[PDB]
């Protein structure tokens, strides 16, 4: 139940989770620097740049 | 906005990015060269965090198929310079970059999202 919040907008590619600054989402995997996440807004899953978010 | 962390090119990235490049009018019909291969590598590395290990093509004469499945940009020979000019001037055609001396051009082919032609045609090259 680690929850992160967007610090910048991210327009991603197929397989990424796109988000906007302030969006909060669950981290589903935190390995490496690209993470799996589910958006609290949409329940949509995808990969995100870890440097775009913070706990 | 910061740079995104580096990553390998998944086939989904390959398909999504190929269509995006296609739609924004890039690459189609442009002459292939080693320099331009590297320019492409560099652009996507420093713009999408793509490690430049995905852009490889099949060897023999004729059409060169991308060896990363999902990348939709193949190399098509064009029917059309001495070696000394090649050395001293930046001629931008694959005539001397290409081991088989063909002049290659980039062509968009979306069936490359459906058929892994490189793998099905040239398994030995993997």
Numbering used by the authors:
A (entry chain D): 80 to 94, 96 to 135
B (entry chain A): 103 to 182, 188 to 233
Authors' account:
The structure was determined by molecular replacement at 2.78 Å resolution with good stereochemistry. The model contains residues 103–233 of SIV Nef and residues 80–134 of the SH3 domain, whereas no electron density was identified for the CD4 peptide.
The Nef protein of human (HIV) and simian (SIV) immunodeficiency viruses is an important replication and pathogenicity factor. Our study thus provides insights into the molecular basis for the versatility of Nef as an adapter protein for the internalization of surface molecules containing endocytic sorting motifs.
